[PDB]
Design a protein around this ligand. Sequence first.
Ligand SMILES: [Mg+2]
Ligand SMILES: [Mg+2]
Ligand SMILES: [Mg+2]
Ligand SMILES: [Mg+2]
Ligand SMILES: [Mg+2]
Ligand SMILES: [Mg+2]
Ligand SMILES: [Mg+2]
Ligand SMILES: [Mg+2]
Ligand SMILES: [Mg+2]
Ligand SMILES: [Mg+2]
Ligand SMILES: [Mg+2]
Ligand SMILES: [Mg+2]
Ligand SMILES: [Mg+2]
Ligand SMILES: [Mg+2]
Ligand SMILES: [Mg+2]
Ligand SMILES: [Mg+2]
Ligand SMILES: [Mg+2]
Ligand SMILES: [Mg+2]
Ligand SMILES: [Mg+2]
Ligand SMILES: [Mg+2]
Ligand SMILES: [Mg+2]
Ligand SMILES: [Mg+2]
Ligand SMILES: [Mg+2]
Ligand SMILES: [Mg+2]
Ligand SMILES: [Mg+2]
Ligand SMILES: [Mg+2]
Ligand SMILES: [Mg+2]
Ligand SMILES: [Mg+2]
Ligand SMILES: [Mg+2]
Ligand SMILES: [Mg+2]
Ligand SMILES: [Mg+2]
Ligand SMILES: [Zn+2]
Lengths: 66, 185, 69, 122, 60
Amino acid sequence: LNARRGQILGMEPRGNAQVIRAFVPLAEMFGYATDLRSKTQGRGSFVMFFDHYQEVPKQVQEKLIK
Amino acid sequence: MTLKELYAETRSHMQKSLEVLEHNLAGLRTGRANPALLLHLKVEYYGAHVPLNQIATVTAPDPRTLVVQSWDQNALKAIEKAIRDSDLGLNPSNKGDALYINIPPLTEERRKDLVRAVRQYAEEGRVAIRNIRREALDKLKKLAKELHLSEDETKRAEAEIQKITDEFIAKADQLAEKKEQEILG
Amino acid sequence: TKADQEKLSQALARLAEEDPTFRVSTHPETGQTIISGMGELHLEIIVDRLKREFKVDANVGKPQVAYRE
Amino acid sequence: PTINQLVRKGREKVRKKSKVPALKGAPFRRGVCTVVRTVTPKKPNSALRKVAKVRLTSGYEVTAYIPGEGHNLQEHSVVLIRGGRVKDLPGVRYHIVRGVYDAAGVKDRKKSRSKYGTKKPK
Amino acid sequence: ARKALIEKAKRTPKFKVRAYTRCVRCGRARSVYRFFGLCRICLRELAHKGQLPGVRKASW
RNA sequence: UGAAACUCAAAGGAAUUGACGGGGGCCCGCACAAGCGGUGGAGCAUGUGGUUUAAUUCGAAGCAACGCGAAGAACCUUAC
RNA sequence: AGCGCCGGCCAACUCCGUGCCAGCAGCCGCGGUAAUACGGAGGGCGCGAGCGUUACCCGGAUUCACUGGGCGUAAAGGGC
Ligand SMILES: [Mg+2]
Ligand SMILES: [Mg+2]
Ligand SMILES: [Mg+2]
Ligand SMILES: [Mg+2]
Ligand SMILES: [Mg+2]
Ligand SMILES: [Mg+2]
Ligand SMILES: [Mg+2]
Ligand SMILES: [Mg+2]
Ligand SMILES: [Mg+2]
Ligand SMILES: [Mg+2]
Ligand SMILES: [Mg+2]
Ligand SMILES: [Mg+2]
Ligand SMILES: [Mg+2]
Ligand SMILES: [Mg+2]
Ligand SMILES: [Mg+2]
Ligand SMILES: [Mg+2]
Ligand SMILES: [Mg+2]
Ligand SMILES: [Mg+2]
Ligand SMILES: [Mg+2]
Ligand SMILES: [Mg+2]
Ligand SMILES: [Mg+2]
Ligand SMILES: [Mg+2]
Ligand SMILES: [Mg+2]
Ligand SMILES: [Mg+2]
Ligand SMILES: [Mg+2]
Ligand SMILES: [Mg+2]
Ligand SMILES: [Mg+2]
Ligand SMILES: [Mg+2]
Ligand SMILES: [Mg+2]
Ligand SMILES: [Mg+2]
Ligand SMILES: [Mg+2]
Ligand SMILES: [Zn+2]
């Protein structure tokens, strides 16, 4: 989740199980559809909702212009 | 006949009754993340009814939802009317070669009959086991007699049968124990 | 292609007064209609229902990176 | 029967059996659905008609019919029911009125709108 | 192949064994009589019609 | 003595005209019989079924479809 | 200026879409590629600031029959 440009916010239990909540930019949120299957053996889930705006680092900034 | 081949025959005979249990436990609306619960269902493929395990691919990605991956989009409408079939009370989306089924949190009216269903399939498995064991002792009654075998021998053959029988019982108890905690979870 | 373009603009018109969250606006430069939305599932059912209730001679990309400056 | 007989016993009056028990003396009754279903009818009709089992505020839980094309009803949906049977759907003694509570009208009705809860077009 | 085959039958082909009689009022490739050029159906249509000279119903 | 819930759009009465009868009566047709030569069995001719096949074109289905539409398929005919 | 209807009862007809599907239905019943019966349109009938629906009472029900019904075979003569 962090190598997906993630900034964690905390974790909590649920079905025991446990829930984890973070902030991830949409661009790095495509493979994550089926990636939770590759990891959790098909036992995880998610929801994903938009939040806000920010300023991408100049590593991806100055390279998106092409 | 003989002993080792009677045990292998027994352990084999009891396995089939055990796997039959697992079949009966998946095909229930469990925690409802199960894929095989929807894998067997009466449909309508070209007039004739047939099991959809020769029609589509059930796969359970996330637990809360489930997909019934199909390969015939005129059968998905035959499946969709066959999912909307009296039972599960579920509202599936369809098409785009897709067929999604989200699962509501099991209510205490259905959670009530789920456990009750599990333990029922549980006991019947054990009775399948125990009825096989008695078949095995009768296989032993003749086999000891037929072969002019010792007494203290034919005693341990009984205990060795019990050892075997308490094998398939503990697993059967453990199967329906887990499947419950997924319903209570 | 090509003469059934006016059913597209009339298809999503039945969904504008029925679902007022997503938008349909053509691109100035590059020039093309972009069907906005809220998510993949939101813009999968619009793509599905149109292809199977409204025929719509169409096939799309499509990413969704929709940046702003 | 003799005039005398009629004095003794008397002409037995005929009783009107109500045709809608769950309604319980009301014109309408609110309820909540337990199943969303499609049930095939008897001979010689073949289809899959939209039927929703509803547990009413009268304590009752009967089988209700969803008229028109396209419904949004699901489990936990709140709905209002009226009278009305179906000659070829046994057990179904009641109709669900479109356009009330969680039950929404049919889209793009033109004829006979007020029966299907469809506002006037623009 | 109905209108293209009766027109094929008007054009003299490449070799003479391919010569087949085609009816001259309906277009049959079988039961076509060279004495009438029609076919056994258009024979009976016109026999009763009398327009076949002399051709009358036989009964002996 | 004798309910109901539920469920059906009929359950019935007689009579009429048909058809049917392992019902009757009086008849006829190579229908049986009485006769005579055949088929099935053999080898081939010809048509279908099936499979085969790039195609083995389509139709005809108990009688009343099977030397039938074809009273002339090497090519043509010929639709595959 | 809206609502209901426009298969028979029962007043008011065609077109297209659909193909025992989607749906209508108060009864008998409609939809299996020419649907006056389904959905829309054009057209028509009926009412009007109302129109349709559900629930109930009575009517038609002479179908609890005093007015004004029956009981051989239809439901019904009591075993005597
Ligand atoms: Mg000892
Ligand atoms: Mg307006
Ligand atoms: Mg022609
Ligand atoms: Mg030509
Ligand atoms: Mg001839
Ligand atoms: Mg008679
Ligand atoms: Mg008679
Ligand atoms: Mg006779
Ligand atoms: Mg022969
Ligand atoms: Mg053939
Ligand atoms: Mg045919
Ligand atoms: Mg004959
Ligand atoms: Mg009216
Ligand atoms: Mg009329
Ligand atoms: Mg009229
Ligand atoms: Mg006319
Ligand atoms: Mg249309
Ligand atoms: Mg109507
Ligand atoms: Mg009838
Ligand atoms: Mg039509
Ligand atoms: Mg009508
Ligand atoms: Mg109409
Ligand atoms: Mg009344
Ligand atoms: Mg009157
Ligand atoms: Mg009157
Ligand atoms: Mg009266
Ligand atoms: Mg009467
Ligand atoms: Mg009287
Ligand atoms: Mg009477
Ligand atoms: Mg009687
Ligand atoms: Mg007595
Ligand atoms: Zn001719």
